[PDB]
Structure 1
């Protein structure tokens, strides 16, 4: 499945296929790691915080 790389149609502003296709970027077959995403999200939401004392 990872080696599979389909063609995704590009849709027009009217919502219909325009006949153009883009091969799926390989990033959409990257591993899905909810634990890593949670770790990065948890540690990156702390960075916009404003100090209180």
Structure 2
């Protein structure tokens, strides 16, 4: 799809449209997302020991 419609403050279409960027046509890779998200969620962690 070339364009995406821009909606107004009232919820109705304004009449202006924007072109969808190329990042929305990128590959969708669940294996990549899962691998990064597993290590990403570890990066906030705060150490514990006895």
1:9 aligns with 2:5: yes
- Structure 1 unaligned blocks of 5 or more: none
Q: Compute the displacement of 1:6 (Å).
A: 1.6
**Which structure shows the bigger proportion of residues in helix conformation?**
1
Larger Cα-atom Rg: 2
Size of the alignment, in residue pairs?
49
Q: TM-score, normalised by structure 1?
A: 0.87
1:9-41 deviation line (CA, Å, top 9, x unaligned): 100011111011000010000000001000000
